[model samples]
Target chain A: VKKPELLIFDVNETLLDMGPLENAINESLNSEHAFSLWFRTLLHYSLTETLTGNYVDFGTIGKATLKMTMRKFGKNLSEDRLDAILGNIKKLPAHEDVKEGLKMLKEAQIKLVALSNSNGKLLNAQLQFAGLADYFDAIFSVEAVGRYKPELASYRAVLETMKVPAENTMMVAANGWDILGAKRAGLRTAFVAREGHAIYPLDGTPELEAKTVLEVARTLL
Target chain B: VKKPELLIFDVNETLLDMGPLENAINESLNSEHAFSLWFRTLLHYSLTETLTGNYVDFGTIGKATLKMTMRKFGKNLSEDRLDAILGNIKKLPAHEDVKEGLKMLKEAQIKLVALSNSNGKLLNAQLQFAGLADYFDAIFSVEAVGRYKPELASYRAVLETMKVPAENTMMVAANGWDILGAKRAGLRTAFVAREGHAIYPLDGTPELEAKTVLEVARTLL
Candidate 1:
């Protein structure tokens, strides 16, 4: 198989922990399992909305669903509490290995970009906050292409913008759905198996699995 | 404490048997569990999309996610296969209890309506197909209101159009999240526990739980 020239990484989980954001949700919603289910639901709906030709911001959906999730738990969230949970999303720290891995990938002359469900402004803020903004060739969000993440259009947008064909592109995401999506779109895929993440038990196996971005880098190299 | 003047029913699992739909999905996707998870994911994301002020058509999201789910299961589906799965959605049969329950509610002289996430055209066709159109005073779809169902605005549209106050309206659904959304928006809620349906384990107790709409009517009277 030919190696791809462009490698796209999913923003959350793959490069960033997002644990703090999940913690904020759990604490605010007063449930321990809120994060996993909430996040999964968020992805599910965001893509659906896009597929339906209706679009909403990822952050807004996060707030509304979090409130609903809390309500399900017999809890009511004040606007202040909801804000606190959503606000933490913007400040999530990258995983310990993200910077080093990016540096290595950059050194190898492989182009690195981020393809995120988050809007461009949010993605930029997230990348800058992680202090790894300098290593990326470009950061793309589904909003830029008028599609949600994990959809074919979103991936196609990335390929078009980067001027690469599907066969010459690689996608790395911690989300099994996104990996499966990338594979379906004919891109090489890497799945980062972060703790607390549920593998889409049904999706075919990922081409590569790694504990951290550094490990992923070693595998790619 | 006062009885609601109007009751809003969710059409799919609340009054219809999704068995045929699920069977179609399983056969098309070649997986038994695909429909269940995909449907849940569809609801989760569709609501999220609406809440965020971005929305997609339910059918579009349904197809896209179903395709992604299939890919995860190591299956490739052509557009024809996807169309077949979706086509089955329109042909779902009403539950055995739906007609009788609606008849009971109608005889009680309480104004009844259907507030569905599907587009108005689809909802109209579904009601007509199910032969339950005569029981409804009005049928509303979130698409007509330019929002997806379960959103505050969507529910608000129903109230505004019907000229009923939120507290005077009762929202009924088999999905726990739907009830939670309606409740959060200040509508009274009834949970219809269809045989295969389950509440969100976390979403506290509903205002009322019934085996069917007839049971709900009995309690209301």
Candidate 2:
């Protein structure tokens, strides 16, 4: 009964495996937990930038987050190593189940689109490298909305772009905050609870939960 | 020229030393960077909750953030340990300069108040334990405004409660985002620039930046 007409997908880690990028950064810091913290810091400060009415590209903020995390250890990472981590981000591969899952959605005739916090050029490059670029009818970056994901306007921009109403659309993301935003914008939400990732209790049981993109597709399609 | 009649203080690492708690958390995670990550996660999710129209206490969110950080290391921290960190929060001691800073402000007849994301009772315990309670005319928390820091409403709540114009109110905190919030709310900002904390370049220049609370009081008083 709550099936949405448009199935929106979140690109990073939900469909792509960022373990390589994660590992490189973590290795550089000599800490296994560095990757997770770095990503959250990246996400946090990205919004902090936007909420404060400024725009710094995601890549720029990513480096600052790296410095802040490295500062905690009282040793700074080398500039070359830091840039290597950033450079490797756009070269990640799709997750094991991603291709199969996306094929199923394509076969099901559900309208699919990719939405990401990354800017347009970077999002395109990443998707193209992963061989997952063609699965969606459209690719969107939050920059189009001039704000990052989870902001009400960001979700609305997607809705308006697709020319669809909220109830008819469902946002699928590995990130809880993204789905939470979609929910707030009146769209349905499906959470892909990746390992080391979670749905915040506040998001309140997204419309659906799945372990992987394939599982979400199986449930929906 | 930009002297504010009332000075609002932030209670956590801005005024109090978080080193002990930081060490315990990072030690648990086996990474020196854990505390900074955990704190950023806490701040990020706090805004995530508020933007999504949900309210959970700061202590509760802090624990969740700790777990999330721990989750990254492929281990789970015990509930009791997590609760121990939360319980130890109010027992923190103020930074070395806090007492001298308060005295300077008191001597100058500047109305000083403590505003924190902490709930009322916990903040009282923290200040009292730190021997800094009697110096403030009032202690305010984000719960009173039903939102957390960096949300404009939280700063507005302080301004309204103090019954002072924005020009006559200043927010002093170690967190750049907090000062940025107050700045946006039309109040002056003084950043503590605490170690591991950097001002967001977008905030332009705040009215004041200090290495210690006493330094801020020196310039203002």
Candidate 3:
């Protein structure tokens, strides 16, 4: 197979560290696994939205699910505290290796971009806040095409926007569903291993497995 | 306090027996508690939808969550089999007490209605099939109101339409959150504690609690 000309990365977890928000969730809810469960529910509902032909903004779903999670766990979080937790989402720090990896990709003449579930404005704001906005050629959000994240159409929209063929675009993500979606969309795949994340054995294995973005960079080099 | 003029009841579990559907789910999924967990997730998502101001049909949410629950348990269900399971929902037998209790309420000159998350058309069909359609003065579904069940506004909409104040309306359900939402909307509330259902302890005490709708009817008499 030829080396891909474009590399698309998932914004959350693949490039950004949600540790701060996770910590806030754990502290506020008094449960170590609160964030994981909340995040899982968020992804689950987003896919459900696609399947059911209903749509909701990701941030709105995230905030509401956070409140539901807290309620289920017997944590009485005030709306103000819930807002604080959601407010932190706008400025989450990128993973330590993201900048170096993006730099390497840029130097290698590979077009670097983001394909995220978040809205374009939110993604741009996060990138700017992370001080890593210069590393990507462009960032595309599912909202740009009015499609949902991790759906084949969402990936297709990104490829169409970039004028790249599926085989020439390598999609990297830490989420199994997102990678599965990319593979189903005919994109080349890279899976970043995140601890405790479920791997879909049935979906075709990713072409590359990297522990961090820097490792992915070395492999691409 | 004045007696409630209108009583809005939830259909499933509160009035309909879900035993057949539960048996089918357990048999198909090969798990004793598959139905229980799916029902909980269904309720969770329904409430989540209301909280987020995005309304989805409850049956659609139920189907989605059922598939998710099946996947979690490593059970792969065909569309036909899923349809078979969901098909039972429309044909549910009314609980033993519903017909008589509704008749009593009708004779007492109290306005009776149903407020379900189910689509209005489906609810009407079910009521007709149960031979209890005439007993209810009206059947209000979230589908008609463009909101899911348990929203404060959903409850308020029914009261406003009935020209009854919240305090003069009684909302009865087997689900804890439904009771909680009704209370939050300033409605008098009764919990019909079917087996395996419990009120959330934090929501404080409801005005009346009974093991069956008939008993609740006796109290009102």
Candidate 4:
């Protein structure tokens, strides 16, 4: 696949290593699958809010889902405990390969931009803390469009703001849904199929697939 | 809670046992959480389609997600194998309390309808196989509106079809997302909190909550 003029990256599980937050959740709920359940629920309802024509911040949805997931296991999470568990989202460590991959792309003079479902403030803090703030030419939040990633409005908002053509841009992400959404909206896609992520069979195939961001960079380089 | 004049039901998991389907998925994928993961993917994409302004039938999305889930488990499911596993959806048994609850509501002369994410043919076959075919005054599917529940249009199409006021109607379902959707669309809601289902803390509380359809019936009676 030819390298695109612009690459829009997905945040959360795509670039950040969620191990700390996952362990914190698994321990808090005392269930091996707690993190998986919470994450899926978080994704589910974020889209739910979009379809229902309501808008809520990602952190609020995360806390709400955490509480719901805890109840499923017969545990209660107080507001304090909920904050204690999810507070690490902003301070998550980057995946081991992220820096090398971003540097490679930056050195190649490829424009990198971060687009996240997370609101502006959280996205800012997350990148800064992970020491990844300077790798991007720009950062965007779904808040700008009042919608989440995978929605055409969200993707198009970024393109309009960046003044980049969708066909000349690529979306890089670990989540299949995010990849699918971008492809549907006319962006080229590369799947960073981290761990459990897989492309949806019904959606268009991503132009590239790699096990990590570094591998994606190697292929492009 | 005042008894609703019209009660719209969510078919899958709410009225259907789904035990056979769940066991089949778990066995096929060799993971206890296989069904949960697949089901969540199915839900997530259905809304993803809605948010993207694209419409795909529920079963197609189900099969696509099943394949995606199988891939995550390092297994392959051919189209034939996929059918063998999901074909039983139409023949699932109703939950034990389903008939008694439906009968009571029917006897009370409260209008009962089956509204499902499933297409019309699947919903028909499911209701017939479960011996629930004759109980509902009407049956509605997301197919009619080209949008799945809990999209407002899907719920509103049913309300408009039956000529019932949303306020006098109640949506009964085991899924918190479904309940939240109906409530937001202006219908009253009763959550059938089947094992593992819980009301979303961020959404409005359902007008009623009970362990099973029979218990919900008993309360109304």
Candidate 5:
């Protein structure tokens, strides 16, 4: 397989371990599925914002969805606690395999960038907190485009900013939705099938699929 | 408040009861939160479809998300069982207050219609099975526009098809996401705050809101 000149990565679960965040959410809501519900709601509304020609930062969406999910379970959470629970996202550790994976890709001289639905501040803090800030040549937040990933405009924003043709870039994401967006925008895709993530049956198969980012890196190398 | 000449209703959980469908999902997955997870996953993927410039029917998305949700709990579901559980949606009973609500609106000389992200066949069957077929002057499916709710085009398809101006139309929905979409398309919105549903803080409050369709209808009248 021909290696792309650049690789754009999706943050969150693709690189960072969501285990602590998941525990925080589930424990806060007192339900095993609380994290799943909150996460999916966050994703739904983020796209809803873009589909309706509106934009809200990912953190705000995260909080809103958290509240909405709490309401579903008939729990009332304090604002301070809400902020604290969602704040776990900003200080996550990278998955055990992610550092090695990024090292391999960086050593191969591939230009790497992070493209997240998160706002710039949160994205930067997350990468920095995870000790992943140095591996990326650049990072992009959908805040710049006022749209979320899976929107063509969001993907196009990265291509335009990086001055790399879609064909010459690969987007790596653990989420099928993100991969589908990258594919739609004409970029090559590698899907890291993280735990609790599944491929969308209706979407086209990504160019590469693996259980973790390190496995994907090994294939590329 | 000025009365709209046309009232467009969002079918699921607005005019119809989701209790049975919810039970089926929960029972099949053996978890109280299975339905919530599956439903959110479905909603997330529907917007994913539109945002990525792809279209798949709501039922197909339901099945896919159900499978995905089951995998999260380490459950393997048979295809036949999956079909049976999801098939519950096609035959749901309308909410207790829906008929009287539609009666009041119909008696007021309003042109009532149903607009759903569901495909044509499912939408028709749902309306018919709910014994609500006679209350609407017309019905619209997102299938016609190849986009789901929250996309302006989905709402506009209903307006353009019925030859009604957006301002003259009121969209009544229990789902905040749907209300936000209708509002963006310039249609008046009445949110039905069904059990477990909460208003999206980022969206504008609907012109009217209530616990059930009957209350929303009372306010409209």
Candidate 6:
């Protein structure tokens, strides 16, 4: 198989850790699954806004969906509590393999890019907070195209904006739909099967499946 | 406010109850919250497929997403067990207000239709199983549109295919996004706030909000 020349990574669970989101979410919802549940909710609504004519920042949607989740439990989220929780989003750290994997990929003279559905400021700060800012040659977000990942337009925008051949580009992510969408858009895909996450079960499958960013990185490099 | 000449209803929680999904889900996951969690996951992936131009039958997506949610909790679901749970879907019963409210709308001579993201056969089986089929003049599914609700095309398709004027139609559902989307499509909207769901906090708000479908029907009739 031909190796991708440009590797674009998904930020939330692929590279950055969710401890910040988890702690903040569980402290309020009082369930260990709250962070993941809310993250999935965030992804769902973010696309709903995009498919409609209206679009908003990812963080804004995050807070809005968080309120909806809490409301489901008949609890209203107070402003101070919500702000404090949202604040941790930008302060997340990288997964254990992210920095090291980037170093290996970089040393091999491979191109690297970051793509996320996050608001520009939130993503920028997340990378900065995680000390992963300088590793990426370029960063992209769905805010530019008014859609989220798994939408063909979002993946197409990455290939077009990054000037990479779709067949020669790879999307690395832990989300099943992200990998499926990238594959559908003609990009090579690597499914980083983070603990508790699985690749989608239908249509096409990823070219590479690894347990961690580092494992996938090793395969490519 | 002007009354709508036709009424559209969202299936799932608004009419048919979730006891089947709940009993099946909680039996395996050991928590009452698994049903809610899996339902949210189902919505997330259904829209993901639609936005990506890779739409699948909602029941198929439902089972696929159920696997994902079950995987998330470190449990492996058996095929027999999985089928047993998913099989519960087509066999759901109507909520307390559904039968009485549908009768009210029928007596009022309002044109009533049912719209769902499920495939035609599955939706047919569901409504039939629930004994709610006779109340609707016509039943619609997202399978025809290759998109889920809250996307304008799904609503527009319903209006165009049903020969109804957007301005003279009202969309009724337990989902906030359903109401918000129908409103965006120029149909009047009624939000049926079931026990655990709430109206979306973003731009558009439903014209009417009530605890039960019967309550909203009373206002309309």
Q: Whose lDDT is greatest here?
A: 5
lDDT of 5 by residue, A66-177 (tens): 8889988888999999988887998799999999999999999999999988899999999999999999988999988888888888888888888889999999999988
Which one wins by lDDT: 3 or 5?
A: 5
Tens digit of per-residue lDDT, candidate 6, span B166-210: 999999998878887888888888888887777888975888888
| Cα lDDT of model 4 by residue, A71-124, tens digit | 777888788888989998987999999999999999998899999999999999
lDDT of 3 by residue, A1-221 (tens): 46688999998788888988889998998866577667765664554454333456788768755765676567778889898988777879988888888888899899998888888788888889888788888888877767665557778887888899999999988876667678878899988886544344434378888888888888877
The sequence of per-residue lDDT tens digits that candidate 3 reaches over residues B100-207 is: 888887888999998887887788877777777788888888887786656567888998898998878999898766776788788899899887665644442589
The per-prediction tally of clashing pairs is 12, 0, 0, 0, 0, 0
Arrange candidates by DockQ, descending: 5, 6, 4, 2, 1, 3
Model 6 error, position A47 (Å): 1.3
| TM per candidate | 0.60, 0.90, 0.57, 0.95, 0.97, 0.97
* Position B157, candidate 2: lDDT: 82
Predicted structure with the largest TM-score when compared to the true one: 6
In the order shown, the chain A TM-scores of the predictions are 0.94, 0.96, 0.96, 0.97, 0.97, 0.95
Candidate 6 chain A: worst 10 consecutive residues by lDDT?
A68-77
C-alpha lDDT of residue B159 in model 1: 87
Off by over 4 Å in 4: A77-79, B74-81
**Stretches > 4 Å off in candidate 1:** B1-100, B105-221
Per-model DockQ: 0.08, 0.45, 0.06, 0.75, 0.81, 0.75
Residue A208 deviation, candidate 4, in Å?
1.2
lDDT of 2 by residue, A136-177 (tens): 988989878788877787777878888988889988999867
Which stretch of 10 consecutive residues in model 5 chain B shows the poorest summed lDDT? B196-205
Give all candidates' CA lDDT scores. Answer: 0.75, 0.82, 0.77, 0.88, 0.89, 0.85
RMSD of each: 9.2, 2.7, 9.0, 1.7, 1.4, 1.3
Quick one: ranking by lDDT, best first? 5, 4, 6, 2, 3, 1
Query: Candidate 1 chain A: worst 10 consecutive residues by lDDT?
Result: A196-205
Q: In candidate 3 chain B, what residue range of length 10 has the lowest lDDT sum?
A: B44-53
